[PDB]
Amino acid sequence: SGFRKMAFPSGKVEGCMVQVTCGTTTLNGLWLDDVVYCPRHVICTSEDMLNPNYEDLLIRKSNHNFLVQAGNVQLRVIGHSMQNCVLKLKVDTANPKTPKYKFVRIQPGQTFSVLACYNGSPSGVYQCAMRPNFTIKGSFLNGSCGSVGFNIDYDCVSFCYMHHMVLPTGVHAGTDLEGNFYGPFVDRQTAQAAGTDTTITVNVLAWLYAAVINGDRWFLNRFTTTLNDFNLVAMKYNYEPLTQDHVDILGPLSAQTGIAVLDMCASLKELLQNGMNGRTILGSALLEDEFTPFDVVRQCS
Amino acid sequence: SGFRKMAFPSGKVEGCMVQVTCGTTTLNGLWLDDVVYCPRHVICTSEDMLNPNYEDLLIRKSNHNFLVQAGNVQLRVIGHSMQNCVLKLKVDTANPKTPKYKFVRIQPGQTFSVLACYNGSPSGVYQCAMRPNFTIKGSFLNGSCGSVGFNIDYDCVSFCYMHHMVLPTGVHAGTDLEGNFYGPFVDRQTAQAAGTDTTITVNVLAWLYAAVINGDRWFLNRFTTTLNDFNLVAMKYNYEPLTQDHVDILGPLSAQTGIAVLDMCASLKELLQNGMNGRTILGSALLEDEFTPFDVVRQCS
Ligand SMILES: CC(C)(C)[C@H](NC(=O)C(F)(F)F)C(=O)N1C[C@H]2[C@@H]([C@H]1C(=O)N[C@H](C=N)C[C@@H]1CCNC1=O)C2(C)C
Ligand SMILES: CC(C)(C)[C@H](NC(=O)C(F)(F)F)C(=O)N1C[C@H]2[C@@H]([C@H]1C(=O)N[C@H](C=N)C[C@@H]1CCNC1=O)C2(C)C
């Protein structure tokens, strides 16, 4: 009953958050087994950000130039390397709170929980989504670098994101846990374009399905639409084109509500062209696109 | 950078979640020290909900009629009592994961994080607020009874809420950790009125202050307003009347943005009478009222 944008329980991730201090720069790290992961720009000063040569910058750094603080217990650094944009600091002591984990590169449109670490410690948790421009609309202040995005399958944590930078628009960019940036972004202080931020169409349909389950039906229309004609009005409104795969993913919601996928797309076409006229759907006046169909299925059962 | 409705890290609360099974009814409990707290309606069947005499119902129950499951370790019940609407089950083993905690009755308008326990285990976390009608707009399915609301001050957990029922409107009602319901609600299956759900005015002003800090200023107007004249247009739009205390709480945001409180109320008056004209503030077309001024201060520093 009721629909909320809830995140996974961050208990398994809080036990892996550490502080990495290189010189005067500090940020958060991920302590899994005997390796600490953090953005490689921790080794840069206020000047190096404009044009950093991370290879030349890391060469002048040694193992002892890294302060890894886990609450109060310091970790001895026995090795370091650079995998793309992530810094892998091998420590002596393995984390006893290491959960079952794996690394995964998340596709645009998929959601994940973010443990935002303000003021040098786990401070908040929220649910967000990977936008088509490979940016996220989150909440990151100074000291939030190293904040990780993750998903939890029963007992396994799927770490997928690590925050690095904020675009001049205010949106955020980051990498996966193997160092590769999501999008055409590079860890360097310079004006970078994000690109057109289209709307995840399959997530919007999943949110409309969640509205029917929760009682809101005013938007249910008396029309239908084909797949190509819906995509015609989709490109005009900066919506991603719907594919037959997206129809298959929305399978369980169509069978649970008795509303076919193409009928739901027909309704969505009317909301784009006519607006909501001030009305609300699930307490919002905007088509929400931060709910994957798997998130709706999880919460509605 | 960026504004999100983030919740506190639920790591300290997950270690206190247990399953309480009385007969065929199961729900979640709060294992603090050697006491387990849960809604007292766990002892009711499907029929007792219509007209329960909890005293007569609890008399026919003994210590062994309560299955307290903490993951896999069962807890031996050595005592039980009824404090208003909460069931205090004294167990033999004290919870080793018991954090520094205390109980607090939250005032309407204040926010707190909720660890929603779907399917018999901690499943999600979200931030919500106590509405003026003492209800909350959350996400609670069957088996969510026993889900707790809490706030975290550095190391101390302030447990303030426990979910019990859902109103026929879909909104949720609950009690504090001493058993007293928030509002005129009673644990009994019968049509109960929630009352007029006014808008927390001080929270809306705090959200507008957060919009100025984040760059959105289109709503900043060129007028001012007194306190009594703003309350005149406040009652018309189902907004709570602003008091001089509310002005004092908004102190830090006015001194940080250089915008006086009465000037911010002047802007808010224009949004109520003219709407947003389809525009957005912090990515929303509705005046958000689930951010206390302390939440904005926490996230904007
Ligand atoms: C806009 C800015 C000029 C700051 C820059 N932006 C671009 O370079 C862009 F234009 F490409 F975005 C940027 O983000 N950084 C500068 C530099 C990293 C990152 C950075 O130091 N960030 C802060 C470090 N703790 C955390 C931020 C600050 C506020 N809130 C946060 O979370 C790197 C790209 C290597
Ligand atoms: C609407 C209903 C008739 C169900 C009733 N409502 C009213 O009695 C009211 F009209 F007062 F609201 C109600 O909530 N309950 C019946 C009964 C308790 C509660 C209840 O058994 N709840 C479920 C138990 N696990 C969890 C719910 C179900 C869906 N999602 C949830 O979270 C008590 C008031 C003692």
From Swiss-Prot, chains A, B:
Q: Which residues of the full protein are shown?
A: 3264 to 3564 of 7096
User: Where is it located?
Assistant: Host cytoplasm; Host Golgi apparatus; Host nucleus
Task: Note the position of the cross-link Glycyl lysine isopeptide (Lys-Gly) (interchain with G-Cter in ubiquitin).
Answer: 5, 90
Q: How does it assemble?
A: 3CL-PRO exists as monomer and homodimer. Only the homodimer shows catalytic activity. Interacts with host FBXO22; this interaction promotes the proteasomal degradation of nsp5.
> What is the role of this chain?
Cleaves the C-terminus of replicase polyprotein at 11 sites. Recognizes substrates containing the core sequence [ILMVF]-Q-|-[SGACN]. Cleaves and inactivates human TRMT1, preventing tRNA guanine(26)-dimethylation of tRNAs. May cleave human NLRP1 in lung epithelial cells, thereby activating the NLRP1 inflammasome pathway. May cleave human GSDMD, triggering alternative GSDME-mediated epithelial cell death upon activation of the NLRP1 inflammasome, which may enhance the release interleukins 1B, 6, 16 and 18. Also able to bind an ADP-ribose-1''-phosphate (ADRP).
The protein's name is: 3C-like proteinase nsp5
**What mutagenesis or variant effect is reported for residue 145 to A?**
Complete loss of 3C-like proteinase nsp5 cleavage
Gene name of the record: rep
Which ranges sit in the Cytoplasmic compartment?
1-301
